[PDB]
Design a protein around this ligand. Sequence first.
Ligand SMILES: CCCCCCCCOCCOCCOCCOCCO
Length: 536
Amino acid sequence: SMIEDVSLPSQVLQDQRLKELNQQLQDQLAQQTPYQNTKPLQDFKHLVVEESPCVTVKEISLIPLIGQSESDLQQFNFVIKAIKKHPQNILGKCIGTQSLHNIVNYAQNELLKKGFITSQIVVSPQDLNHGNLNLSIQIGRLNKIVIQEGKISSLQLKTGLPFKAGDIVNLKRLDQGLENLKRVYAVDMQITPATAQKELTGYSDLILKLQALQKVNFNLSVDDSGNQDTGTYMGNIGIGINNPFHLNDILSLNVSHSLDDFHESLNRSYFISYQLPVGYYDLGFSYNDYQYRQGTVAPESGYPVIYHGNSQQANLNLSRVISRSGQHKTSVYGKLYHKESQSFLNDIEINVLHRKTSGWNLGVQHRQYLGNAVLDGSIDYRRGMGVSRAPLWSADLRYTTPFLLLDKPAQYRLNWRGQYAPKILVPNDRFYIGGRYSVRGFDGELMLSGDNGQYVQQEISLNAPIPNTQFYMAVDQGWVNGRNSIPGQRYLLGSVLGLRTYQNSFYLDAFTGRGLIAPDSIKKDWVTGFSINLSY
Ligand SMILES: CCCCCCCCOCCOCCOCCOCCO
C-alpha cells in the first residue's frame, strides 16, 4: 500500500504562515531606542603623563565609605581590575594631578560601561602621602518609583521591573523594565535626585509618566494571491487584547479561513498566544488548531472523495535576557511543544496517519543596532519524539537599514532562514521553498524540499511621491540539499515588484512577480498578490 498525506501542501503553508504570524507578534513589542551612553570623551590610551609634582603609587585599592559593607564593594572590583589591567601599568608610576584626573575619568567611564549612571568614583587622597591610591565609590541608589501619571498595580511594578526601591541604579535594569512596561503603556521615564526636607545625597527618584494603550485591537485581512489561472483567497480576523490580567501581559487571537484553488482545499485556523514578562524573563504559551477539507464536494462521478483532518499544537516558552546594552539585546530561550494530527477519508480515519509528537527547543536570539541599522537573528536546536531523538538545527537572520538611492530615502531588507538536519526527516519536518513565505515570485503549487535548506529574501523599498506610500522590488533565492532532495532541482530564483500604502487605518500590499530560475518541473509563471488589512 502507498502511504500518502494528500494534505502535506496545505500543512506546510500553514506552518510557514504560523511562523510569520509569530514573528509579527514578537516584532510588535516595543524596544528601547538605541543609544551610546558610554561615550569616551577622551580615549584612554595614556592616563599617566609627566608632571611637575608627582607621587609614586604602590597600591591601588577600593576603600569603603562610611556605612558600606565589603559585600557592597565586591560588586565593584571590576573598576580596580580595569585600572590595573591598563597597558600603561599605573602601579609604580609617578602620578601628578593631571594623571590622577585621567585615572579617575577612566574608572568612571568603566562605571558607566557597566551601567551605573548615578554612581561616582571619588578619590580619598589622604593616603597618597604613603603612595596608596585609594579609590571610593559613591553608590547611587533608588529612593522611590514615582508614578506621576497613569494607573499601575504594585504587582505590575514588581513583575515588570527587575529592581526595587533601595537597589543600586543600573541602566540595564531600567531599560529592561521600561521595555516590559512599553508592551502595555506609553512610557516616559526620567531620573531625578531624591529630595529630603533639601536632598538625599546618594539617592534617585524614578519619575514615570504612563498612558495605557488601547485595550482591544482588531485586524481584518483579505489576501488574493495566485497565478493568472488559479489562486488562493484568505481571510484573517486578528484580536489583540492589551494588559488583560494587569500583568503587562498581551493576549493575541487569530482566526484564518483559506480557499486554495491550487490544491482544491478549504482551511480554517485558530491561534491564541499569551505572553507576560517577569523582569529579564519572558513567559509565553500558544495554541494552534488547524482544519482542512480537500476534494470536490459534488463530483461528476457521483462518488464524493473528501480528505479532511485536524491538527493541534501547544507550546510553552521561557526566555531570559542574558546581556543587553544601548546597542544590543541577547537572550536564551527554551520551548516545550506537543503536536497531534489525524487524517480522514470520507469520515473514515487513516490509522497510519495519526501522529502525536512532542519535544523541546533550546536557542539563543540576538538583536544589534548600529546607527539606524538593525540586525537580529536566532539559532535553535530542536529534539522531538514520535508515534526518536530527531535533532533539527534552525537559524534566522534579518537585517534592515535606510539608505539614499538616487537622492531619495530608501530601505534595504534581508531575511535569511536556514535548516540543517543530521538525520532523515519525516516529510513535514523538511525545508520547503517556492511561495510567498519562502521564495517570492512563485505560486507555491509545487515546492522544492530537502532535509537541509535555506532561503535569502532581499528587498529595497523607496518612498513614493505620495505620502505614506512606498514602492518595492524584491529578489529571493532558495536552496535545498541533503536527503529527500534530487540534484538539478535544488535552486529557485524569483523576483517581485509591488507597492504598499496606508490610508487612515487601511493598508494595501499589491505585487506582481515571476520565477526567474527554476527546474523544468516548475512553471516560472507570472504571479500576483493583493493584501488588504484594516486595524481599529
Ligand atoms: C550550527 C547550525 C546552525 C543552523 C545552520 C543551518 C543553516 C545551514 O543551511 C545549510 C543548507 O544549505 C542548503 C544548500 O545550500 C547551498 C548554498 O550554500 C551557500 C551558502 O552557504
